[PDB]
Design a binder for this molecule. Structure first.
Ligand SMILES: Nc1ncnc2c1ncn2[C@@H]1O[C@H](COP(=O)(O)OP(=O)(O)OP(=O)(O)O)[C@@H](O)[C@H]1O
Ligand SMILES: Nc1ncnc2c1ncn2[C@@H]1O[C@H](COP(=O)(O)OP(=O)(O)O)[C@@H](O)[C@H]1O
Ligand SMILES: [Mg+2]
Ligand SMILES: [Mg+2]
Lengths: 365, 177, 281, 210, 277, 52, 70, 105, 52, 52
């Protein structure tokens, strides 16, 4: 079944299974942890079941920021009201030696599996950076009298990662919706730890560096992230057909990028300029300002409903909004706010002046 | 009669209303010329400016004091404060004189103008100088022209133009100084 | 374009998310429809072995096979990633032994080794832990003998030994179209064919994303349906003349108004080879 | 264990609690880069540990913009909404003008198309780039920095083309009353009681650019 | 997998030398037309100081001529006047006039058919095959003269320099239907010019406006040729810089891939050796 | 890449060589036309970065 | 010729050959920079095409004939 | 090059002079140290180099400084192996170089 | 401080730090040995220091 | 690609200045006077800065 996340590119191109696994593949500075905080701020409030946030080898300051967020947002209530709390943090952050980072994912998984098996309710396991578990095992495995495998890793990488990641799955008695960040080592998707980790995730959402370099946040690569729920038997034919349309236009733009870089948009034919214009509009339109990113930007965060995603993206695929420029789709909620920003965008192009007098900046008031 | 107030300076404001505002107004050939018609003066004595033209070249733009145009009612000379003129020229010789020096140019047929400011605009297609023409094959060219006489009015016009052009070349090659 | 005969090892190789498993499952699903029409002797009994796959994925496929009725003819050997590496080393072999009973007794068999590039990893784990010296990338040099002992068991025997057959379908996961990888370069030389799937064709609409310039079958047109041989003999030529006229027109340079037709004719064929998820025609 | 080396080295730079003394510690690890690649091993290791980045581009340093802060890739999200707020009023506008200058400088790598309003952006950004860069070993306090960015995010400096801003910054630092520096330092932010003085003083400036 | 990035460097480097050759071609051919454009600029001033400049006239039938290039390496030239065609054809329509859009050049029919096809009749191609000649201009002018519009508009880019290409509308009116009508200011400002024709003024103005159309169309398809060489020059030095920066990035990636491959295959040997002895 | 161009057999015409390609062994009229075909194919290979 | 160098140089070259090889390699160094322009043969510059045809003179001059020592 | 540093150190510290040194082609000193550190059985580092590259090059380059007695200025020719400045031999060389002088053809 | 070697280009554009390290990106036949010998001669003539 | 006489007067004075500066960076070297004849000239620094 569908899990509505309230992110545009997530709910359109790689929708999350409510009883599945969710992966975030990031390359140090593309924002997988900010994306998982927005996924917390959307999902973990509406999804009333218990949540387990197991930080495996990320920054300690982010753990303290999450603790000061989940105290004052009512997620964790201290003092006499410890029972009303809805999250349990397991923290083995990156100051701990690589024995301790090699098992803190297993601790968070055991806390999730007690809520799955005995309690019998739907659990949100938010494992932070599960690659650091593989890194801690690889640091241990240089000393355990073993031989190094591929790039530098364990000989026993695959069965260890399987023995973790096949626990986090939804049984007949309970469900565990697992959101895992997977740090790619050096923007190297052929590395055996992300290459093994791709085969275990139901709806992989890969975050790229180049899309972050264009400022498009979140920097989800729309052509490499996918799901198993992206199929016309579970989501209805309209959503699947609009998803295949937007992926078709984005793939054709990524084909045309070479000739665009060498020659420019002048050499291309008019239907290819139409494809490029539609592709730039739907490429900026996957961006949104987040509700967790408002602490360093000032822009208020926007939750986007799934019907508004399908409306806006179907409209920009068919051509109902071809008149609007590129910047009208940058950092916007949905297709109402696109035309609302096009109103604001037009308005300031002429009214730019006239502040010389009628100011408070005389001396005597 | 003149109910359309057009113009290049009026075209800017009527261009600002329908086209989107992001583009500069296109230019007009009135912006690429400064020597106008009713700009009074431009004589300053006996030297009147001469704009001798050609589609592929510019052979003279300096100032003269006499130009003789082979008009269809005859050759006529242009002076400093000449009459405003729209003259269709016969195929013949134009006479460029600046004073004591005199250079003669054979023209092939094309208009010639004088505007009220005393400036001239000589506008002919092929302005062949008399040093690059021959006196040998012109009689053979007329012998070709005085031979083929069919009944078509189109060929009659082209052949009569051939006779008049070749006979003017003969008259403007036999009596040379 | 790549027709598959009984006794042929045909490789299904792609990137991470191409139509690899789904083009294999369609071969199992359609063997419900044929075996409800063909007689008893020429029946195909599929065996889908899963090597290193997720255990929820195998419970989806037995949900799918019991939903369409394909479980009446299918063995499902699951070596999940919970199983230790000596199990996933073994399960393509033991799946072949469960399938070679049908090659022993005159029937026709079908075996699909899912992700043999995870059998090599589960063989890489033991050989690096029994202290055998690593060769290429970490693999011991006999990882060719790992697969060649296995894929060469799929054969069509002769008519005195029962006349049976066994069609393989090894599946190989590359990284980024890296057909120069060590594990993939073994299997491309072993198997009779190659069905190379590309992801940038998969998002351009081509589903199955058969990279038709790079897909060949050494058994060829001697082992296909006779009605499709005379007809589609120009089909692989008509797609061949689609690619180089699309490799020139991409700049927006010039058209010839007759090679515009041969690019249009291939475009009525490129959209013709698309097929749905679980649809046997 | 190089990741564990850099991790257990850098993780001790904290801001301690109010019951543990209230102290702090600020790191500045400097990573040598070869040909500017962010995708190394050590660079992508230390980026996943540090709370921000300060990217120093080689191309911006070669063109005389010293310091060569690549403001596109340089992010520090713990310090924003934790900084001096009198700077933070004009600094967000400064970020937008620098981002617009980055975008229009990428859109015009060569000057052929003139839109006469994008040229206002291409003038303002080359003005602000000249305002922000400085000479070596020269610390500038926050009260002499808020004024110098206040007088450039607004007008008061478009009178020079691009050149004599190297004189104009020290000119506006010299020609303002140094009483306003104490107010802007002690208050913390640009009050309207000081905003009207800041608009008042900035128009009587003897600017050497004309 | 290290063979892809070397042959891609091989491709991008020769593309860089191709555009480094064609910038020489275009900047050379801009100069051999520069000895003719200012000469073809000779006959464009007397007609406009004689006929005036009256574009915004309510014609009943009008042939707008948007002359474009031949080879599509323009660079801000062909689509520029394609949008200028509708931008100067839309401000002129107020009462539903007949409009005959004519495009010169092979890159006119490829672009002007999209926006205005129902008013599109003539597409003149291969006009810059050898060079530009005046009899070609007379022939295309006569092929416009087979129909009898009330005005003409000629859309072409004025080559002022190698950076500035401001498109221009050259105006040619119908002689007795609109040209002599627009000169009616307190009588006629043309009648001060004394006629020296064979027949009356009414059929010498026909000859004059046919010559005006032929001259200005010759000037248009010469200035568009010289600005086409200038714009191909300005476009081939951006493809050279683009295939310079792309070659630099691919050379950096080739060096990083070279170091990664030699380090990995060295690690392979050391892991094979120390696990043996 | 010649096999993908459909030439069956996919013999690479340039890098296929022999020691039996000396004109004092096989006669000159064979070696002249063979080196001519090699030169013409090499000019086509140098040109197909601009034809492309 | 663009890569193959002798670190001795012309100091031990045969004299007489030294009189001509310095001009030969100079025109060939101009040729290798004006190389890959022969495909645009219709576009001349009248001096780059002279050094282009002279490089085509000299590059087809230095051919050998399979154990023909001169 | 350590013998060269010794005769230069005698001309600097005892004779009190302003000494020049010329390390001929410092990449070959890197290559000789790489050969002696691959010879003794140490595990080779990145692209092919010795694991003690930085410290056994800094053992050479750090005796080349100014002193209160005199100075040693060394002029070392640097050759880049694949003409790549991401290579670890010029990357570990150029962190000691103060002034580069490109000679052109 | 600066080392006056005597050449105009290496004392003006890229100065020689007295006590620092110098990189020569030479080649063959570009006069690198003549540059070395002139540097030795100038420093030994003026600054009173030898060379090795 | 445009011509030698094409550039303006603001730049071609600097073209002459660079073409007389770049030849001025050369120097006769005293160690090469054994086969060049011209004796070398050791240049001071302040003279280089002023004369440049
Ligand atoms: N013929 C098809 N038409 C439309 N969609 C398809 C088709 N075949 C596969 N898909 C879709 O493509 C996605 C990937 O298919 P498939 O299961 O073959 O991936 P895969 O490569 O097997 O992944 P993995 O190898 O990791 O299991 C699936 O979500 C499936 O719904
Ligand atoms: N929605 C967003 N809006 C603005 N910036 C974002 C957004 N998501 C991520 N970022 C940027 O990505 C950077 C890295 O994010 P973070 O998740 O902390 O890094 P990592 O992915 O390495 O944990 C942050 O500095 C933040 O500015
Ligand atoms: Mg994080
Ligand atoms: Mg699969």
């Amino acid at each position: 079944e569908i899990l509505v996340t309230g992110i545009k590119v997530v709910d359109l191109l790689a929708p999350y299974q409510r009883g599945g696994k969710i992966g975030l593949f990031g390359g140090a500075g593309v924002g997988k942890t900010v994306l998982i905080m927005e996924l917390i701020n959307n999902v973990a409030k509406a999804h009333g079941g218990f949540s387990v946030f197991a930080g495996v080898g990320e920054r300690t300051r982010e753990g303290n920021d999450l603790y000061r967020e989940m105290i004052e947002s009512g997620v964790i209530k201290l003092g006499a009201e410890r029972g009303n709390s809805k999250c349990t943090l397991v923290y083995g952050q990156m100051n701990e030696p690589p024995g301790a980072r090699a098992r803190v994912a297993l601790t968070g998984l055991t806390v999730a599996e007690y809520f799955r098996d005995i309690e019998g309710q739907d659990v949100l396991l938010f494992v932070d950076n599960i690659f650091r578990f593989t890194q801690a095992n690889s640091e241990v495995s240089a000393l355990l009298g073993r031989i190094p495998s591929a790039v530098g890793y364990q000989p026993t990488l695959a069965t260890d990662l399987g023995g973790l990641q096949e626990r986090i799955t939804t049984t007949t008695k309970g469900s565990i919706t697992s959101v895992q960040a997977v740090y790619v080592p050096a923007d190297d998707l052929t590395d055996p730890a992300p290459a093994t980790t791709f085969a275990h995730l139901d709806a992989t959402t890969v975050l790229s560096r180049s899309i972050a370099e264009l400022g498009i946040y979140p920097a989800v690569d729309p052509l490499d992230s996918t799901s198993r729920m992206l199929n016309p038997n579970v989501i209805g034919a309209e959503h699947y057909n609009v998803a295949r349309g937007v992926q078709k236009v984005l793939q054709d733009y990524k084909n045309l990028q070479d000739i665009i870089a060498i020659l420019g948009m002048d050499e291309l034919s008019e239907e290819d300029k139409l494809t490029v214009a539609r592709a730039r509009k739907i490429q900026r339109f996957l961006s949104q300002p987040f509700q967790v990113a408002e602490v360093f930007t000032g822009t208020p965060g926007k939750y986007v409903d799934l019907a508004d995603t399908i409306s806006g993206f179907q409209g920009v695929l068919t051509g109902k909004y071809d008149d609007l420029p590129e910047m009208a789709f940058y950092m916007v909620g949905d297709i109402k706010e696109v035309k609302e920003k096009a109103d604001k965008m037009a308005k300031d192009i002429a009214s730019r002046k006239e502040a010389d007098n009628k100011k408070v900046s005389e001396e005597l008031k | 009669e003149a109910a359309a107030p057009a113009g290049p300076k009026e075209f800017t404001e009527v261009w600002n209303k329908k086209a989107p505002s992001t583009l500069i107004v296109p230019e007009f050939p009135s912006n690429y010329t400064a020597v106008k018609a009713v700009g009074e003066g431009q004589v300053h004595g006996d030297a009147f400016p001469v704009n001798f033209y050609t589609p592929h070249s510019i052979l003279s733009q300096a100032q003269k004091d006499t130009v003789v145009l082979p008009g269809v009612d005859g050759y006529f000379g242009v002076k400093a404060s000449h009459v405003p003129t729209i003259a269709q020229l016969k195929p013949g010789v134009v006479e460029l004189h600046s004073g004591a020096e005199s250079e003669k140019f054979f023209v092939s047929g094309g208009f010639a103008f004088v505007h009220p400011n005393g400036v001239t605009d000589i506008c002919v297609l092929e302005a062949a100088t008399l040093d690059q023409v021959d006196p040998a094959a012109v009689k053979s060219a007329l012998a070709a022209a005085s031979a083929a006489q069919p009944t078509d009015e189109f060929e009659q016009a082209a052949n009569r133009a051939a006779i008049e052009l070749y006979s003017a070349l003969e008259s403007a090659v036999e009596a040379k100084a | 374009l790549v027709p598959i005969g009984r006794g042929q090892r045909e490789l299904i190789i792609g990137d991470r998310q191409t139509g690899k498993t789904a083009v294999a499952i369609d071969a199992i699903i359609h063997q419900k429809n044929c075996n409800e029409q063909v007689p008893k002797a020429q029946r195909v009994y599929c065996v889908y072995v899963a090597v290193g796959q997720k255990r929820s994925t195998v419970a989806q496929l037995v949900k799918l096979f019991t939903q369409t009725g394909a479980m009446r003819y299918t063995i499902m050997v699951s070596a999940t990633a919970s199983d230790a590496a000596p199990l996933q080393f073994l399960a393509p072999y033991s799946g072949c032994a469960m399938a070679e009973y049908f090659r022993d007794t005159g029937k026709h068999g079908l075996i699909i080794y899912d992700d043999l590039s995870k059998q090599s990893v589960a063989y890489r784990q033991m050989s690096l832990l029994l202290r055998r010296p690593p060769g290429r990338e970490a693999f011991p040099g006999d990882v060719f003998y790992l697969h060649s002992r296995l894929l060469e068991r799929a054969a069509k025997l002769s008519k005195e030994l029962g006349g049976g057959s066994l069609t393989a379908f090894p599946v190989i996961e590359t990284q980024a179209g890296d057909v120069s990888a060590y594990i993939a370069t073994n299997v491309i030389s072993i198997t009779d064919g190659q069905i190379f799937l590309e992801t940038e064709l998969f998002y351009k609409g081509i589903r199955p994303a058969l990279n038709v310039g790079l897909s060949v079958s050494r058994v060829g047109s001697a082992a296909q349906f006779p009605g499709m041989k005379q007809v589609a003999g120009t089909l692989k030529l008509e797609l061949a003349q689609y690619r180089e006229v699309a490799a020139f027109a991409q700049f927006g340079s010039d058209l010839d108004a007759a090679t515009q037709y041969v690019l249009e004719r291939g475009a009525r064929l490129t959209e013709m080879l698309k097929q749905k998820q679980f649809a046997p025609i | 264990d190089v990741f564990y080396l850099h991790s257990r080295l850098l993780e001790r730079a904290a801001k301690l609690s109010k019951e543990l003394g209230g102290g702090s510690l600020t790191a500045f690890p400097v990573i040598e880069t070869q040909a500017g690649d962010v995708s190394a091993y050590i660079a992508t290791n230390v980026i996943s540990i540090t709370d921000g980045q300060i990217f120093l581009e080689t191309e911006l340093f070669y063109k005389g913009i010293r310091p060569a802060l690549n403001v596109g890739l340089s992010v520090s999200r713990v310090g924003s909404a934790a900084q001096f707020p009198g700077m933070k009023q004009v600094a967000g506008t400064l970020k937008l003008e620098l981002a617009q200058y980055r975008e229009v400088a990428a859109f015009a790598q060569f000057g052929s198309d003139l839109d006469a309003a994008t040229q206002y952006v291409l003038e303002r950004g080359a003005r602000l780039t000249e305002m922000l860069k400085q000479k070596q070993f020269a610390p500038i306090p926050i009260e002499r920095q808020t004024v110098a960015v206040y007088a450039a995010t607004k007008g008061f400096l478009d009178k020079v083309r691009v050149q004599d801003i190297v004189a104009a910054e020290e000119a506006v630092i010299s020609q303002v009353n140094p009483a306003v520096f104490k107010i802007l330092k002690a208050n913390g932010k640009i009050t309207p009681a000081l905003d009207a003085h800041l608009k008042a003083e900035l128009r009587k400036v003897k600017l050497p650019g004309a | 997998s290290n063979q892809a990035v070397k042959q891609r460097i091989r491709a991008i480097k020769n593309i860089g030398k191709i555009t480094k050759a064609m910038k020489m071609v275009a900047a050379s051919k801009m100069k051999n037309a520069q000895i003719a454009v200012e000469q073809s600029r000779g006959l464009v001033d007397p007609f406009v100081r004689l006929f005036g400049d009256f574009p915004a006239v309510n014609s009943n039938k009008s042939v707008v001529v948007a002359v474009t290039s031949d080879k599509g390496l323009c660079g801000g030239l062909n689509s520029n006047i394609t949008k200028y065609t509708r931008a100067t054809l839309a401000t002129t329509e107020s009462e539903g006039k007949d409009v005959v859009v004519v495009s010169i050049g092979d890159k006119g029919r490829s672009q002007l058919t999209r926006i205005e096809s129902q008013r599109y009749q003539l597409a003149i191609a291969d006009t810059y095959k050898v060079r530009v000649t005046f009899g070609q201009a007379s022939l295309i002018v006569e092929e416009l003269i087979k129909h009898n519009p009330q005005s003409y508009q000629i859309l072409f880019n004025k080559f002022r320099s190698a950076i500035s290409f401001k498109p221009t509308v050259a105006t040619i009116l119908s002689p007795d239907l609109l040209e002599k009508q627009l000169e009616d200011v307190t009588g006629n400002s043309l009648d001060a010019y004394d006629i020296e024709a064979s027949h009356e003024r009414s059929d010498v103005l026909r000859d004059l406006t046919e010559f005006h159309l032929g001259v200005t169309l010759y000037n248009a398809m010469l200035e568009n040729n010289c600005s086409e060489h200038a714009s191909r020059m300005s476009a081939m030095e951006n493809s050279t810089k683009s295939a310079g920066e792309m070659l630099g990035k691919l050379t950096l990636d080739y060096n990083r891939k070279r170091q990664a491959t030699i380090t990995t295959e060295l690690i392979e040997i050391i892991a094979g050796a120390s696990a043996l002895m």
